[PDB]
Nucleic acid binder design. Structure first.
Ligand SMILES: Nc1ncnc2c1ncn2[C@@H]1O[C@H](COP(=O)(O)OP(=O)(O)OP(O)(O)=S)[C@@H](O)[C@H]1O
Ligand SMILES: Nc1ncnc2c1ncn2[C@@H]1O[C@H](COP(=O)(O)OP(=O)(O)OP(O)(O)=S)[C@@H](O)[C@H]1O
Ligand SMILES: [Mg+2]
Ligand SMILES: [Mg+2]
Lengths: 486, 254, 319, 253, 255
DNA sequence: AGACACTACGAGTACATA
DNA sequence: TTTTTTTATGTACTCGTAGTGTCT
């Protein structure tokens, strides 16, 4: 092996913790967490401490790629005497063999730490393992991939567990919410990377000035690996870099990453984009690509927060209400288009049209400043709640079908306003001696206690029984529960 | 260069088949004394050592101790093509980039020359130290294999209890438990059980590693089992000129 | 007939980085890289037919010399490139021992990298990270957005652009000089006009015109290759009077056999990529074109629907 | 309390292999006169009834009717420890929590022990009806498994016809047709292979192919099988080795 | 009316199993001299030609030439429905449709009647290839199948080279390379293990691994297989049966 | 005669869709 | 600042009982 055969990112890789750039707080927190790991296992993780690290036996590092998560993890692993072990998605990771291996390795000692050196007074921890998992977000979605298996692994283990992923808040990563201590590595500061670039430039005889690293890391968006690769790629031809050719370099190395459904909502509802000047800079093709970055949450977010802005593109003689009405009309048209898309015939070739009608046109109608905060779309939770209520109403209707002889909606609209007066009202106006009447009325339609509980949740407006059931004396409720349980 | 001629290719075939389900990349160091191969498991739990002496080859040749990085899957693919009655010859030239395998038939002149590309195994060579063992026993390899195959069907943890000249193999799983009791009986005089017990030892191993070790139950008739309370247990299969050893680390004796 | 001859795109496929008339900056960059060595991981993105696959092929050939056969691993979209392949074959090639000069490295060329699955792309990260001192990766794709950001973070990004008129004209003149073909200025102009920055399509049209008529003239080129589809659609949409647009749609598009789906899709794409008119009128035209497309897809695709779409577009443009 | 010393582990292995993929979790009801096992699938077409008497054991002893719930997969997992030269001894106590299985070898130096944790399952009532069957046949079990697995390839509906003292197995698929015709045969040189047929009225029914495929799995128990066909009651499929027997009650469509 | 009765019912099973994987549909031509069949692979890389004379049929009656187009994944299922000591009977009416198979046991009384719906295959298959080859070799079928299955694991292309009394099978892949070299010898103690080779000019051409693995599936028919190679000509892999033959015309890969 | 490595075809589970 | 939205075929993975050639 020679020197010119490795990339600049490998020959300038950090050899110790004192050369990492930025995120000093995170690396110190993880170092303290790994240091007190045996102090945490000797008392079974009950004492968390002042740092709050010690109750969780696993640590999950999450942040953008290329900021030094894996590097810092490996560095602290070699520095604290822990015998390092790495396994990731590049190797086979399933529910069958990965689970078996990790289970056999959670409370087994290392032979490498035993045979290498075990006689000097270095540490009693060399016999231990540190299972460092990389690309945790790269596993398969289902349980067969091993994400839930690893989540359960982070609950029962005698060796420190280190998890490293690039994307944290994902559905697949939901089980890791309350099981492992979360550490977030953030965008590094400009000074440390500036000094590192100064050093790596003076070492390679690369002419470079301090005025350009700011724009460089701005267009790179906090990625030291990409910056190093950029310098290694362009330093071979252009020996001296300055403020003359930096424009072409920034335009050719623009990081094209898809935005989250929250930044997409900010860019869509930005009034400067739709101005006469901003139109010829962020063209309509870019606006459609914005929606195509995430075409599942963009229309919902747009419909949620299109009427929560202050418009700055109002035509002369048009109020905010008119623009909101036109935006809602286009939202309805885009909804019709989406229904035509995600139905039979699979008219997916209409996806670009759904880009304009659902997101682009309503946002353009009410583009401007953001008044409050970008609120997440509540249509998902409302749909889930409506589905649960529909399932409950279906159970109630199929229980009462033997007597009602009506439909689901016909039972919800008209029958429930009378079932409320029949079941619950005798409890408020008669006391605890009206239990038998309610029991007979419920058995007349084969109702259950769970059905009685679910019935009182359908009413709204001036009839909210959530406090009426609490106003009922607890004696009557206990007597009813005991009577129905006999 | 190097030119090592085997007696029967089946010997090397069984040798590779013994420890090919635990490790994948192995460094074979060939010196004037013979072949030495140490391989760490991907989980760094089970270390495999293998020694083949100069008196196990029909003809041995070596001008310099050379390391060969081999993938056991491709090596098994190459060795599977041979028959039981051929002479196997490993050949390596200067600047080793590949290894040649000659399968020469004895009743004909049909020669089968295969090539196997070497790998870059950036692994450090460690040192193996022999120490006193509190218990050292021997028993037929097939019987131990069947005990492991019977106990692994309940759990992945096997508790070994050597106490009062009795061997206790315990498997505590989800659906019941399993126990196997062994008393040393020295009688055929070859299928006996030779056991020396100094200290009563209590260890716990992984059933998967035990299965991967007993998969090599074709190189000998019995297994040499050496136990230690603070050292990894030694499972040995003896050869005509070498051995195949597994240094399996016990679990946490909390 | 017994056998055919090699096409001019394959016969005159560049084998040296100097023969590439593509983007000069990236070409000189790759030339200096092949001269000095130490080729890093790279991702070349762009449009079809601009010299992306040929560029990486020339780079690998010049960098490996005679060791190209045993040091370069080519994987196209025609081969299986799933998680299993990346796990077994790519890792075995990266771990393979090979004695190379002290300035060269093993190259893994992955054509059509935008088609690899997410699992394979995720597994390739550590595969290219642990063997970055003896194995280098070169991806060639058309959409860099289809490749995950972790993979893009470990490599250089080379965005190839369209070929200007001068470069394609120079390459066609070189090919004509090497083939002794009778041509004319207007014929080459029509060829370049119908190429639209596509060098492969330009050479293919040139060879087809040569083998069909012998003389490369604008009349022959236009009679064998029709005018570009989006330009007639743009001229139809940008019409000032309704009758002109109707006559254009009737004669140029409908009387020549262009399906209504293709017409409405081209109209949508042109209105999306239009820059002559404002944003609001463009959005209204896109809305009307989509309303028409919703009827075209339901099987109601006729000339009357396109005529009504043009009438509605003109009514929108009618203030 | 319950201590049953089996003649050979292979016998219990086969009697369990008879119905591996039929049911999962069942309750063996053990009494003094023998052990009965009743199982019902989810599709409500087959009724697995296994009866093993005291004379099938080399030693069986019990003094209290008890119930032993267990899964079949774990049961086969424990039986996989068995060999060809060891006997099984089942031990159960007054508090059913775990069955203790002792594998004993003729050499008294190697004894094996295993345990099986019980599960609680809602048992079903015994179906021992003797409703009159139209026709009754007896065919070698291997030949019946062969013909069933052969006819299962053409169509998923096997038609059985008993007419003119001729048994007809038809399978009309989409690629073609299948019709295996057999006649009653009585053999005097090998009294295990014979086509016994007793008919009172012509029979003509249809049955599911995968159901017969699940039934024929018990061919390892007996050398021949008895099939009783009836037009108004579920058909009976009966295997018997020497004293312990297994029955499938298939409800025809 | 086609009426054929085989001596052993398992011969037809072993014959059809040869085409089961490498051929999808077949068109049996039945004449007064025997049954001929020619089929082309889905990828059109190999051509199967089976010929079975009236010597194999214990009884044979062909009033007029009959064409039976059928599928093999169903004929194999119908054949597996038979028995090892049974006899097979093929019946076809005057107009070819719904061919009938009859399995009859010779030890007991048993009749298994199966039907198979014919299919109208427009493509005719009557081509015969009779041209001299550059080399003609003959080797045991098991010895050839072993080499094929052993070299198929190394790569997807197997190169055959015929030189002056030398037969070489080379396979170069990603995990390594390999080459088996054999010489034509004459074995007097057993004639079915000898290797014959008559060459006119050296030959060197490659095949794919999948088709070569599918071809050797017919090794269960005869104990010796012949290989005819020529300069850019369909290689003839022939298994000779006591009443005819099965020949695979395999197409090499261009270099 | 038989046991079990090798293996290939079948049900399950998700993941995109310009 | 936070998690689901039908049907419809193409694509990719895995475990998986299964069918058959091979080894103590
Ligand atoms: N803070 C840093 N200071 C200096 N070099 C760094 C830093 N972070 C990353 N690097 C360089 O980037 C290389 C790769 O670092 P990694 O830790 O592997 O990246 P990462 O943050 O783990 O993101 P991944 O690998 O895509 S999940 C290192 O070898 C260094 O050369
Ligand atoms: N810069 C160029 N100079 C000369 N010929 C070129 C150039 N670019 C393309 N060609 C011709 O076009 C043919 C195909 O080029 P490719 O590199 O395969 O196209 P591409 O840019 O890779 O786009 P794809 O493959 O459709 S994604 C080559 O064989 C050449 O004949
Ligand atoms: Mg990392
Ligand atoms: Mg290309």
């Amino acid at each position: 092996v020679r020197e010119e055969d490795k990339l600049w990112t490998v020959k300038y890789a950090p050899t110790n913790l004192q050369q990492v750039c930025g995120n000093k707080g995170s690396v110190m927190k993880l170092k303290n967490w790994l240091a007190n790991w045996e102090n945490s296992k000797k008392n079974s993780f009950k004492h968390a401490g002042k740092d709050g690290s010690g109750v969780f036996r696993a640590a999950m590092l999450y942040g953008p790629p290329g900021i030094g998560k894996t590097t810092a993890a490996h560095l602290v692993a070699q520095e604290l005497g822990y015998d390092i072990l790495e396994q990731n998605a590049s190797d086979v990771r399933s529910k069958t063999l990965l689970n078996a291996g990790v289970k056999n390795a959670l409370d087994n000692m290392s032979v490498v730490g035993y045979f290498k050196h075990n006689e000097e007074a270095q540490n009693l921890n060399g016999k231990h393992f540190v299972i460092i998992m990389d690309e945790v977000d790269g596993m398969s979605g289902g349980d067969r991939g091993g994400v839930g298996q690893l989540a359960q692994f982070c609950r029962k283990t005698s060796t420190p567990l280190i998890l490293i992923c690039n994307e944290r808040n994902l559905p697949k990563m939901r089980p890791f919410d309350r099981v492992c201590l979360d550490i977030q590595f953030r965008r590094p500061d400009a000074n440390s990377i500036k000094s590192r670039l100064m050093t790596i430039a003076i070492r390679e005889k690369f002419k470079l000035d301090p005025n350009v690293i700011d724009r460089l890391i701005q267009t790179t968006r906090g990625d030291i690996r990409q910056v190093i690769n950029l310098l290694s790629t362009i330093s071979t031809t252009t020996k001296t870099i300055n403020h003359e050719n930096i424009n072409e370099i920034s335009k050719a190395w623009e990081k094209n990453i898809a935005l989250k459904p929250f930044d997409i909502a900010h860019k869509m509802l930005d009034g400067q984009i739709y101005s006469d000047i901003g139109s010829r800079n962020f063209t309509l093709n870019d606006k459609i690509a914005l929606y195509f970055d995430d075409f599942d949450f963009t229309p919902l977010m747009i419909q949620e927060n299109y009427l929560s802005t202050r418009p700055s593109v109002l035509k002369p003689g048009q109020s905010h209400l008119e623009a909101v009405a036109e935006a809602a009309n286009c939202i309805s048209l885009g909804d019709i288009v989406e229904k035509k898309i995600r139905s039979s015939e699979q008219l997916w070739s209409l996806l670009p049209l759904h880009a304009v009608l659902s997101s682009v046109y309503p946002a353009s109608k009410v583009a401007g400043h953001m008044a409050g905060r970008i609120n997440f779309t509540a249509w998902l939770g409302q749909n889930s709640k409506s589905a649960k209520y529909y399932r409950l109403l279906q159970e109630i209707h199929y229980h009462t079908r033997l007597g009602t002889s009506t439909d689901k909606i016909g039972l919800r609209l008209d029958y429930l306003p009378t079932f409320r007066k029949r079941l619950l009202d005798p409890f408020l106006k008669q006391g605890a001696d009206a239990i038998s009447s309610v029991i007979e009325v419920m058995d007349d339609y084969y109702l259950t206690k769970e059905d009685w509980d679910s019935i009182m949740e359908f009413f709204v407006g001036p009839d909210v029984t959530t406090a009426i059931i609490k106003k009922i004396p607890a004696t009557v409720k206990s007597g009813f529960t005991r009577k129905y349980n006999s | 260069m190097l030119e090592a001629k085997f007696e029967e290719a089946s010997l090397f075939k069984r040798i590779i088949d013994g420890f090919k389900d635990c490790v994948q990349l192995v460094n074979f160091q060939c010196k004037e004394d013979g072949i030495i191969a140490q391989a760490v498991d991907d989980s760094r739990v089970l270390l495999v050592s293998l020694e083949i002496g100069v008196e196990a080859f029909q003809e041995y040749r070596c001008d310099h101790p050379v390391t060969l990085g081999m993938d056991l899957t491709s090596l098994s693919k190459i060795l599977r093509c041979g028959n039981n009655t051929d002479t196997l010859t490993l050949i390596a030239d200067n600047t080793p980039d590949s290894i040649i395998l000659l399968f020469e038939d004895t009743k004909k002149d049909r020669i089968a020359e295969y090539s196997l590309k070497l790998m870059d195994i950036d692994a450090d060579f460690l040192k193996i130290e022999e120490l006193q063992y509190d218990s050292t026993l021997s028993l037929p390899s097939s019987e131990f294999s069947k005990i492991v195959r019977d106990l692994s069907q309940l759990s992945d943890s096997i508790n070994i209890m050597i106490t009062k000249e009795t061997i206790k193999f315990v498997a505590d799983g989800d659906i019941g438990s399993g126990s196997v009791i062994i008393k040393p009986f020295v009688d055929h005089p070859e299928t006996s059980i030779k056991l020396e017990m100094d200290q009563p030892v209590d260890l716990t191993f992984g059933a998967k590693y035990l299965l991967d070790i007993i998969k090599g139950s074709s190189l000998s008739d019995r297994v040499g089992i050496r136990l230690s309370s603070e050292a990894p247990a030694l499972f040995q299969f003896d050869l005509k000129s070498g051995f195949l050893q597994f240094f399996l680390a016990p679990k946490f004796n909390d | 007939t017994l056998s055919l001859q090699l096409p001019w795109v394959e016969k005159y496929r560049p084998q040296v980085l100097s023969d590439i008339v593509g983007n000069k900056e990236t070409i000189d960059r790759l030339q200096q890289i092949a001269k000095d060595g130490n080729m890093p991981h790279m991702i070349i993105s762009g449009m079809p037919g601009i010299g992306k696959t040929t560029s990486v092929h020339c780079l690998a050939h010049e960098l490996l010399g005679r060791s190209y056969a045993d040091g370069v691993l080519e994987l196209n979209a025609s081969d299986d490139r799933g998680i299993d392949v990346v796990r077994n074959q790519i890792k075995h090639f990266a771990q393979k021992k090979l004695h190379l000069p002290p300035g060269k490295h093993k190259i893994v060329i992955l054509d059509e990298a935008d088609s690899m699955t997410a699992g394979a792309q995720q597994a390739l990260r550590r595969t290219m990270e642990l063997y970055s001192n003896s194995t280098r990766f070169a991806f060639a794709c058309n959409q860099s957005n289809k490749i995950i950001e972790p993979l893009q973070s470990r490599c250089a990004i080379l965005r190839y652009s369209k070929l200007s008129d001068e470069d394609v004209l120079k390459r066609l003149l070189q090919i004509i000089k090497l083939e002794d073909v009778k041509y004319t200025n207007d014929g080459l102009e029509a060829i370049i006009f119908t190429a639209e920055g596509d060098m492969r399509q330009a050479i293919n049209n040139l060879q087809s015109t040569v083998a069909g008529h012998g003389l490369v003239n604008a009349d022959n080129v236009f009679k064998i290759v029709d005018s570009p589809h989006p330009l007639i659609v743009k001229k139809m949409l940008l019409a000032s009077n309704l009758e002109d647009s109707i006559q254009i749609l009737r004669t140029d598009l409908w009387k020549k056999g262009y399906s209504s789906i293709d017409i409405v899709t081209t109209s949508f794409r042109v209105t999306k990529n239009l820059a002559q008119v404002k944003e609001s009128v463009r959005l209204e035209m896109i809305k009307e074109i989509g309303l028409t497309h919703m009827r075209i897809l339901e099987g109601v695709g006729t000339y009357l629907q396109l005529a009504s779409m043009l009438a509605k577009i003109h009514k929108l443009n009618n203030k």
